[PDB]
Design an enzyme around this catalytic site. Sequence first.
Site, PDB file in Angstrom:
ATOM      1  N   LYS G  62     -17.874  14.925   3.642  1.00 42.26           N
ATOM      2  CA  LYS G  62     -18.873  14.749   2.590  1.00 42.26           C
ATOM      3  C   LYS G  62     -20.253  14.461   3.171  1.00 42.26           C
ATOM      4  CE  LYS G  62     -15.633  13.236  -0.986  1.00 42.26           C
ATOM      5  NZ  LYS G  62     -14.389  13.390  -0.183  1.00 42.26           N
ATOM      6  N   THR G  91     -19.342   3.419 -19.868  1.00 43.97           N
ATOM      7  CA  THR G  91     -18.785   2.300 -19.112  1.00 43.97           C
ATOM      8  C   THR G  91     -19.848   1.315 -18.642  1.00 43.97           C
ATOM      9  OG1 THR G  91     -18.782   3.704 -17.135  1.00 43.97           O
ATOM     10  CG2 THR G  91     -16.715   3.496 -18.378  1.00 43.97           C
ATOM     11  N   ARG G 139     -32.514  -7.962 -14.168  1.00 51.33           N
ATOM     12  CA  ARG G 139     -32.357  -9.003 -13.165  1.00 51.33           C
ATOM     13  C   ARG G 139     -33.118 -10.259 -13.577  1.00 51.33           C
ATOM     14  NH1 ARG G 139     -29.134  -5.831 -12.095  1.00 51.33           N
ATOM     15  NH2 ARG G 139     -28.078  -7.502 -13.251  1.00 51.33           N
ATOM     16  N   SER G 170     -25.026 -16.585  -5.738  1.00 49.69           N
ATOM     17  CA  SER G 170     -26.198 -16.240  -4.940  1.00 49.69           C
ATOM     18  C   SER G 170     -27.366 -17.176  -5.217  1.00 49.69           C
ATOM     19  CB  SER G 170     -26.601 -14.790  -5.206  1.00 49.69           C
ATOM     20  OG  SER G 170     -26.901 -14.588  -6.576  1.00 49.69           O
ATOM     21  N   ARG G 173     -26.802 -19.993  -3.172  1.00 46.96           N
ATOM     22  CA  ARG G 173     -27.111 -19.575  -1.811  1.00 46.96           C
ATOM     23  C   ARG G 173     -28.599 -19.346  -1.579  1.00 46.96           C
ATOM     24  NH1 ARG G 173     -23.195 -15.855  -2.579  1.00 46.96           N
ATOM     25  NH2 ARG G 173     -24.395 -14.114  -1.703  1.00 46.96           N
TER      26      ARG G 173
END
Lengths: 97, 98, 93, 93, 82, 82, 323, 107, 110
Positions: G62, G91, G139, G170, G173
Amino acid sequence: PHRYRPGTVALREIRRYQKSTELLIRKLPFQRLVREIAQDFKTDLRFQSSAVMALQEASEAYLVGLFEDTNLAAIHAKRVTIMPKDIQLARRIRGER
Amino acid sequence: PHRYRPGTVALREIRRYQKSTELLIRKLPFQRLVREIAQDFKTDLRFQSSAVMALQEASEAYLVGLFEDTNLAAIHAKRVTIMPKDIQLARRIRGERA
Amino acid sequence: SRKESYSVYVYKVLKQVHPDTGISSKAMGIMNSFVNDIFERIAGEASRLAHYNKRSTITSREIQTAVRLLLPGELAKHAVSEGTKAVTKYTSS
Amino acid sequence: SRKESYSVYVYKVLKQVHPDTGISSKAMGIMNSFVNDIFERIAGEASRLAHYNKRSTITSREIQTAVRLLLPGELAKHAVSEGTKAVTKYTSS
Amino acid sequence: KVLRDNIQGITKPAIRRLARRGGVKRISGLIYEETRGVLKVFLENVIRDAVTYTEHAKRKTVTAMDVVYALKRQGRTLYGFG
Amino acid sequence: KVLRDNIQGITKPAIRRLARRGGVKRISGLIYEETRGVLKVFLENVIRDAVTYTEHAKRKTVTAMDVVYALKRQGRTLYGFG
Amino acid sequence: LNGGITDMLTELANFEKNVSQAIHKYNAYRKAASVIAKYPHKIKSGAEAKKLPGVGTKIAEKIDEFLATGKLRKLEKIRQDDTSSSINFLTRVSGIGPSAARKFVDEGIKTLEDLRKNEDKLNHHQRIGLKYFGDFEKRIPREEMLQMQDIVLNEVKKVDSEYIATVCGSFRRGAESSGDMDVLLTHPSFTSESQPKLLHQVVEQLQKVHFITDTLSKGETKFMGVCQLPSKNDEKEYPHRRIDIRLIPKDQYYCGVLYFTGSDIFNKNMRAHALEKGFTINEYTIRPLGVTGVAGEPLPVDSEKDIFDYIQWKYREPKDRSE
Amino acid sequence: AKTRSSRAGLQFPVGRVHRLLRKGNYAERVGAGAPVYLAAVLEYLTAEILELAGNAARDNKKTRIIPRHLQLAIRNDEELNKLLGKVTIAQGGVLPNIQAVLLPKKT
Amino acid sequence: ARAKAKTRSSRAGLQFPVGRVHRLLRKGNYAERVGAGAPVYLAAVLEYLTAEILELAGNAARDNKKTRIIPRHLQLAIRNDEELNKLLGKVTIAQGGVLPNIQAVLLPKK
DNA sequence: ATCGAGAATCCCGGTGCCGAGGCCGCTCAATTGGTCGTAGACAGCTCTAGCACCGCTTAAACGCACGTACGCGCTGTCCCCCGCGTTTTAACCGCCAAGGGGATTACTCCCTAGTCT
DNA sequence: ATCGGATGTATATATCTGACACGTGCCTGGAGACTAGGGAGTAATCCCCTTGGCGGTTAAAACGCGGGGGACAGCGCGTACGTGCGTTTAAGCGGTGCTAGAGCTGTCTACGACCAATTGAGCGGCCTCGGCACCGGGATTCTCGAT
DNA sequence: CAGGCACGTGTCAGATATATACATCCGAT
């Protein structure tokens, strides 16, 4: 008194029971026998009338065939009286034993 | 002149051929017979060797069973010598011819 | 062409029951044919039962009834016991 | 529900052969059972042939071989001839 | 009342009639017990298969269909019923 | 070439050995001819089915698989060949 | 330097997941995409990329085809397929997976317009996902996370001062953005061997102050919902954000915090270190490992530093838990 | 365990039996418990045949199963003879059986 | 469209239904696929067999001076024929009976 | 080695009966017309093994001799099964109740599938 | 009692099977709760077919008995089948050579599965009158004891 | 899709089977 010779009253009604197609076994004794045989496997079992009739037909045809083979063996044995050893030989040759 | 009674040299052969597993039929004549039978249904046919061997096995087993039933019929008829009518009766009762 | 055979499984069973003996190749083929014949018979009887009772699947009952129908008394009872034990063991884990 | 049977077809065949005969209920049932038995035997033999030859479908050739292999002699020959004629007539549209 | 000794229901005249249809001329005396025994064996063999058939479908009545199935299993193929 | 007669290839000692394996002591004279006839008809019956199986597969070689299928079709199942 | 190589491989496993329904590819393709994304070299040949064992020919072919032609014909054909593209687009809605999108496309529902027009065909979770499709994909800046963390902690201590809440992930973190909020809560009276309304009180309190706007699912252990910061009566309203609430027993709370802090690579390395030190660490507790592999009774956990000391490893700040 | 056979504690393959059940067009759906049960039945029957053959094979100072031993084991047993009454075995031979009438004079 | 219908049995000129045969073949789970020519061929074979057995049964029924076929006539027709008896050697007919057959030895020698 | 008495059976006629066949009203499976994935038909390749032939080698087949014992015909004993008559008996047909069992819905309940981070 | 076929006992081939070596398609590849529906297990009915019982009639079964013809044991025999021996001849083993066709693979291509839409065929219900079952008497035929 | 691996098939050392020699032992004669 008029007495027929032994053997004629056999071939007569041999013609009758080979020309006719009734059961030749009474219904109720066979039904009771079937129920007694069945109760040994599962207690309290019901039977349809058609099932008992089919059992009677198949068993009676099997017995007729077995008697045919027994008579054939008896004739082969230089004899006209069928004996239980003839049935044993026919069953052993057929593979049932 | 050491001659055995007739019948002893029968059982000496009975036990041997019942204790063994040999085919008892020569392979080449049976192969020729099989080819002769087969050419009546389709010309120019060739056979695998294993097919001929399986045919020989089946025919040998069938003949052994037929001879056993013939022996039983012969003994039932108060006799020790098998006759073609014994084979006829055995095949008839077995259901084969009719 | 990879053939499909039951050779190693028959050998494992034989070692499990008679560790000190061996088996010839012809006997191996005979055992393979016997296993195939029994499997075909049982599967055919189970398919017949499933078609008979209007069902659309084969479950453990179908195979069990086939085993009870074909095998004689002692063999059928022992086979049903062994198979039921195997099914319970497989389900419990 | 509904119980399907070959009664009307057997009646039509009987009228087509013997225009002045009847048939009883038990004879009709026997004929129906015979038809089902023969159909089952032929279909099973065709399925077995397809499985043997690694094929996935049953065609006219498989049914013809099964008929030739089940029916004896002249009965098989006449059945094959009649079926071949019917297949030719059907494919002629 | 549990059934008992019903093999004697197959009377000697019935066996005689069956043998006459079979085609025998004269019949011995010790044959009736053998005929009853083989009849019982055959009936047991058929009914065991029929009962096994009628229990896999969760049912308590032996249908003639089950009898036909059991007979066909043994290589009899009884026509007529069903 | 063309095989004229080979049923005589099943010799008298071969039939005698087969019968001894069967378990007989004394053999008549017509047993050989009768056994040759029976063997010929049985071989014809098996070979017809085997040839039909071979023809259906569009093959010119009759393999052992066709023979064992033909034998299994008549109820005489054979082990050790496939 | 494989920005285009990585991006083209992204959607390929997604069709394997939502259309082909094969996770056994999806996982391999995402592992390959991650390992390519961190490789500091522009790829020239697929055989060179095969140096990552696990580049069986399937990825190598590929990538070679992509380098040679600039695209993949399989990818181009699957891009223009209406059914596959519709399923993939559906989806993206939370709660709509492979089966749901497949069934909707089977009955013709393929766009957000049809999804809106077929309210009766949706459960509560799917309707909430439909309502906030745009908001959920946005976000979340760190300053907004600070504001809503302060609000959550204020409400949690308002319910009861003995509650302990930690926002993991996160954001813990130190990442500048996150896709969702995973908030972990415990209670001293709630241990592994010890109230089913402890989480309910917190949920009701946060709903009272109008912080939680929607409820997706709420049980005795974990709560799924939506939160939104209030606007200062004149600015544009803040987008709705996905918030998770999980209640953990006290003896398992710090282990859960360590598990949900991340990262995944760091967690895997810590589990490997525990395994080589004869311990097993999971989401819930840590257990010693016997000589035969039998796990013993779990060790008491009262701090993350305790967990680090168990495996003879120096305590690491969440900022240093990248790997 | 990993293999399905190991879970059931059998040496016969659950997977191969299941695959044969699928391909054999016996029914369009096959339950999960059927192949395990069938494998157990086949394993028991194979074990019975093999143990009977060994109890026969061993007795002639022979430690290797031969088709003759298989034929002896099948014919000697009663239930197995009924199970395989219409089956012939290559190189199987015949049971040693001479009728009492065929035996010679007492003398 | 939808031209006037004509059953495939009528297309093949058969009294037996080829559609029912096709449905039974499909739903009996004999093979994965079923060809189009197989049901016609099978129905033709079944029709030929039924026609033959019914012809012999009708001949026997008219021989016995009857207008209506009964199972006895079917049994007589099956057993009298040589090929049909071989085909149905292992079949028992309900209410069929037995062909008149007396061994020559049992007849009175006189 | 047929007459004739005696009995069994076919034939003709009369009477009633119940189910075989025909008609009507349907329900649903057979038929039409399309699309689309694929089983295998048709060519091309190997390369395995079945066939044909030849040259020993010898074990099985065979023709012939000869004894002998076993199938078969025959004869005499006897015993047990059949034909017939007389005396039970339970098989069968008529009616009744009845009762649980195969065929339905119907609520729910553990089991199984979806999902998700 | 002697002597040719069964036994063991030792030995020398020999050979077909089990312990390694390497490849190749099968075979199975994270978890812990939280929704959401499903076959069916049991609760609850609905006919209704089989079960059971009681009584009346009587065809059929059980029982007795006098034979007479068939099962069966014993004798005699003569010829058909066994065992043995010399001879032939065809099976069997081992090369040597050849090509017909079994087995496999690539390429499409018509063919059958599958799905709307339509409708005529076969199944269920409901008459109804005629082929056939049944009965009775006459005529015909089969069987056995003597003249 | 990438690994892990149980069978499939091929190979050679060698237990196990077979055949070959002589000394006892048992049904016909």
